[PDB]
Design a protein around this ligand. Structure first.
Ligand code: HEM
Ligand SMILES: CCCCCCCCCCCCCCCC(=O)NCC(=O)O
Length: 454
């Protein structure tokens, strides 16, 4: 079968279709028009975008495809290096990092992070209880304060103190600019036009800000007994090789985990709150569970694990708007995809996750509705139908960290406040490679339930 392909622009082929501030949403619209697979060509590069579970399940076969660095991740690698997110599976530092850092995500480790996650969640609840009657909440802004603070504290014993700042933390400002520039470089046909000189200067200055922060984390740790993610980065030995990470790689890991470890989580909490306010009956169910389950002044680790419906709400937000919305594969050898599409060794595929999650042959016709009951019995969901955390040995290492944090915080929010979508907010999804609502504001009325000490 010949592969569908969207409209072209002469010798720029499909490239100018990425000349938009919302490229993923543009690709989703193309997949809607063109179907489960389409080709996207740019000068000197081709990729194929997959949207159906039937083809994505094949792409998820690790004997035939391996993780690829999409052009977006190659640009991120300019500041994330061979950190765990932007390394190739065949690079020595990927498996060594994965082996050294995995223990930081064990259940025993998670039980150990719980108190520090509560410390930050209590700061969030206190900030909102302290608002005056005439004020409102800027949701994605506060969720980024919470999630950055939480990976800082749990992962690095470092306080960003983001709730002490009315503007974004300077790491956030540089990170966002750096991910923005990566996204913007995707549609640049001549990246070395001197018209991009100031883009390049500003990129370097952004990277220097992130690395100065990494310096402070490393120095604060030297000056400081912890056993956290940074402990394993600095001292952990890979059981296979017996070697620890080198200093250069360790700096890439800290940048990696500070970014990967909070940005997508902030997106998830923002979208879950959005869907809750837009679906009052769902919000009533979740708030009922939070009140029934969270009987103590602050939540315990077991209580969080008991918030089943809140967990379903977060999964159903990840179904509609997975906040790292694509991952890319390459063919290990020549092969035929779906019995219809021949690929040569090295050909790249991109999995368009929001489109996979709207495959009506899996989910039924009502894929746009927000229905957490979809996830009541997760074992009934077909393999490779639901993939917000990527695939196989390159799947997200921090998936349980993110879900525990989001479930704890959303459970505390729902216990402590009633929420009003006071402006009838129209969803506007800002892209910086990752997805988050922009402009989403709410009002929160305290239920005046006292909050225990940290
Ligand atoms: C809801 C929140 C999250 C989402 C949706 C998410 C999504 C993903 C996805 C889609 C990938 C695969 C990327 C690819 O194949 O190119 C991935 C990998 C990764 N994520 Fe997450 N992530 C989240 C939270 C986290 C957190 C909290 C951490 C750290 C504490 C983290 C650290 C990582 C790392 C280090 C990788 C690379 C894993 C490897 O290849 O060894 N992520 N994530
Ligand atoms: C260092 C940790 C990095 C954390 C952020 C990771 C970003 C997640 C990637 C999301 C996918 C973005 C898709 C961008 C649009 C697209 O398809 N571009 C084509 C291409 O990238 O080559």
């Amino acid at each position: 079968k010949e592969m569908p392909q969207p409209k072209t622009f002469g010798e720029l082929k499909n490239l100018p279709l990425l000349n938009t501030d919302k490229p993923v949403q543009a690709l989703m619209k193309i997949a809607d028009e063109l179907g489960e697979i389409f080709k996207f060509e740019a000068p000197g590069r081709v990729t194929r975008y997959l949207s159906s579970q039937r083809l994505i399940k094949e792409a998820c076969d690790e004997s035939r495809f391996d993780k690829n660095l999409s052009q977006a991740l190659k640009f991120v690698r300019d500041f994330a290096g061979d950190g765990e997110f932007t390394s190739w599976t065949h690079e020595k530092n990927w498996k060594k990092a994965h082996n050294i850092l995995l223990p930081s995500f064990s259940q025993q480790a998670m039980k150990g992070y719980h108190a520090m996650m509560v410390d930050i969640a209590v700061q969030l609840v206190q900030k909102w209880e302290r608002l005056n009657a005439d004020e409102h909440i800027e949701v994605p802004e506060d969720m980024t304060r919470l999630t950055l603070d939480t990976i800082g504290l749990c992962g690095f014993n470092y306080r960003f103190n983001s709730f002490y700042r009315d503007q974004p933390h300077p790491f956030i400002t540089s990170m966002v600019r750096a991910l923005d520039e990566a996204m913007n470089k995707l549609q640049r046909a001549n990246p070395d036009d001197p018209a991009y000189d100031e883009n390049k200067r500003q990129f370097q200055e952004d990277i220097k800000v992130m690395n100065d922060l990494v310096d402070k984390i490393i120095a604060d740790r030297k000056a400081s007994q912890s056993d956290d993610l940074l402990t394993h980065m600095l001292n952990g030995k890979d059981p296979e090789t017996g070697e620890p990470l080198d200093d250069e790689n360790i700096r890439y890991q800290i940048i990696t985990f500070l970014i990967a470890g909070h940005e997508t989580t902030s997106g998830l909490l923002s979208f879950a709150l959005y869907f809750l306010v837009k679906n009052p009956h769902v919000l009533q169910k979740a708030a009922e569970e939070a009140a029934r389950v969270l009987v103590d002044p602050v939540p315990s680790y077991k209580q969080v694990k008991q918030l089943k419906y809140v967990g379903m709400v977060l999964n159903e937000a990840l179904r509609l708007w997975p906040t790292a919305p694509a991952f890319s594969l390459y063919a290990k050898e020549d092969t035929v995809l779906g019995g219809e599409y021949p690929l040569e060794k090295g050909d790249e595929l991109m999995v368009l996750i929001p489109q996979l999650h709207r495959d009506k042959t899996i989910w039924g016709d009502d894929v746009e509705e927000f229905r957490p009951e979809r996830f009541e019995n997760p074992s009934a969901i077909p393999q490779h139908a639901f993939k917000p955390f990527g695939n196989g040995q390159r799947a997200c290492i921090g998936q349980q960290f993110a879900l525990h944090e989001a479930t704890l915080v959303l459970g505390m929010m729902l216990k402590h406040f009633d929420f009003e979508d006071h402006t009838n907010y129209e969803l506007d999804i800002k892209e910086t490679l990752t997805l988050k609502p922009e402009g989403f504001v709410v009002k929160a009325k305290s239920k005046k339930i006292p909050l225990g000490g940290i």
